[PDB]
Amino acid sequence: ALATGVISVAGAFLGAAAASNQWNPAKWDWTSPAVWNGLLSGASIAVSFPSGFVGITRSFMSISSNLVKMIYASLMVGGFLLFVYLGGGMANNFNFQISQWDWKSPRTWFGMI
Amino acid sequence: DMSVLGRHWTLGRDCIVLDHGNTVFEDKQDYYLVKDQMKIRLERDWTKPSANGKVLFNMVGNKDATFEYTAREEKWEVSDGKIRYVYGMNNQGVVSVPGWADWYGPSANYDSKKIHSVQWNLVEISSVAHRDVKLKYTYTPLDPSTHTMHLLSITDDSNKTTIKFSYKTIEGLGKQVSSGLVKEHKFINNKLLEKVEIDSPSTAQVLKLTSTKIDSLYYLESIKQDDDPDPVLGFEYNKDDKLKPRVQQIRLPSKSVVDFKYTKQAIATQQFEQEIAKMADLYTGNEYSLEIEKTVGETDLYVRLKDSAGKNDFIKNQSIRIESYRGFKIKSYSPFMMHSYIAILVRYAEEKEKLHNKIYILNKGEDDSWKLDTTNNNSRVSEDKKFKYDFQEDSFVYYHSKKVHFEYKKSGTKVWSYTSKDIGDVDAFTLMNRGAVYCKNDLVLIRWDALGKLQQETLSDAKSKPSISDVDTFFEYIDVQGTFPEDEAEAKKEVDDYKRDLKESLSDYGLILYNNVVALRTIKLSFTGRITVKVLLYLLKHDYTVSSRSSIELQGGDLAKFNLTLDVFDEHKTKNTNDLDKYRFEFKKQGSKFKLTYIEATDKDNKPTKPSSQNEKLIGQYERRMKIPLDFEKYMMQVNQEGIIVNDHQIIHDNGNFIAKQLDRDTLKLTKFKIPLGAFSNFKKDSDGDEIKLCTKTEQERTESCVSLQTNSARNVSIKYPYYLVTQKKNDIKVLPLKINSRGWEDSVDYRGEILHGSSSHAAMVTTRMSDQKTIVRPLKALNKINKIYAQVISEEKLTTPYDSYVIKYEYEDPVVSMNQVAFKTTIVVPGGGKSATGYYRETNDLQDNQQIVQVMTADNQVFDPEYVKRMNEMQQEEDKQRDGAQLDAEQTITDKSGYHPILKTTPYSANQELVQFLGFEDYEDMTGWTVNKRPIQESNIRRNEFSATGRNFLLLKKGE
Ligand SMILES: *[C@@H]1O[C@H](CO)[C@@H](O[C@@H]2O[C@H](CO)[C@@H](O)[C@H](O)[C@H]2NC(C)=O)[C@H](O)[C@H]1NC(C)=O
Q: What is the DSSP string of B64-131?
A: EEEEEEETTTTEEEEE-SSEEEEE-TGGGTEEEE---SS--S-BSS--SSS-EEEEEEEEEEEESSST
- Give the whole-angstrom CA distance, residue B344 versus residue B353: 23
- Give the whole-angstrom CA distance, residue B846 versus residue B825: 7
- Give the whole-angstrom CA distance, residue B282 versus residue B164: 55
Rg (CA), chain B: 36
| Contact status, residue B347 vs residue B357, Cβ threshold 8 Å | yes
Closest-CA distance of chain B to residue A76, Å: 10
Query: How many angstroms separate the alpha carbon of residue B716 from the centre of ligand 1?
Result: 8
- CB within 8 Å: B627 and A110: no
- Give the whole-angstrom CA distance, residue B221 versus residue B234: 6
Closest-CA distance of chain A to residue B931, Å: 31
- Give the whole-angstrom CA distance, residue B718 versus residue B733: 11
- Give the whole-angstrom CA distance, residue B88 versus residue B31: 13
Q: Whose CA is nearest to atom 6 of ligand 1?
A: B730
Q: Whose CA is nearest to atom 5 of ligand 1?
A: B716
For B128, list phi and psi in degrees, rounded to 5: -60, -50
Q: Which are the contacts of B853, defined by CB distance < 8 A and separation ≥ 6?
A: B843, B844, B846, B866, B867, B869
User: How many Cβ atoms are within 10 Å of B262's Cβ, its own excluded?
Assistant: 14
Task: Choose the closest CB to B148 out of A51, A61, A90.
Answer: A51
Residues in chain A after which the backbone breaks (C–N beyond 2.5 Å): none
Ligand 1 atom with the shortest distance to the CA of B755: 20
N residues, chain A: 113
Question: What are the contacts of B150-156 at 24+ separation with CB within 8 A?
Answer: B150/B4, B150/B191, B151/B13
Nearest C-alpha in B relative to A27: B669
Nearest Cα to Cα of residue B567 among A23, A111, A92, A78: A23
- Give the whole-angstrom CA distance, residue B851 versus residue B868: 13
User: How many Cβ atoms are within 10 Å of B611's Cβ, its own excluded?
Assistant: 18
Distance of CA B742 to the CA centre of its chain: 19
**CA B346, B641, B407, B423 torsion-angle sign:** negative
> Looking at residue B728, what DSSP letter applies?
E
- Give the whole-angstrom CA distance, residue B889 versus residue B209: 39
Declared resolution, Å = 3.3
For B872, list phi and psi in degrees, rounded to 5: -70, -30
- Give the whole-angstrom CA distance, residue B128 versus residue B137: 18
How far, in Å, are B277, B887, B894, B915, B916 from residue B907 at the CA level? 73, 12, 11, 12, 11
| Contact status, residue B921 vs residue B956, Cβ threshold 8 Å | no
Task: Determine whether A17 is exposed, middle or buried from the number of CB atoms within 10 Å of its CB (0-12, 13-18, 19+).
Answer: exposed
User: How many Cβ atoms are within 10 Å of B789's Cβ, its own excluded?
Assistant: 19
User: How many Cβ atoms are within 10 Å of B167's Cβ, its own excluded?
Assistant: 16
Which chain A residues are closer than 8 Å to B186 by Cβ?
48, 50
| Contact status, residue B719 vs residue B711, Cβ threshold 8 Å | no
Q: Which are the contacts of B522, defined by CB distance < 8 A and separation ≥ 6?
A: B465, B466, B467, B470, B471, B510, B533, B534, B535, B536
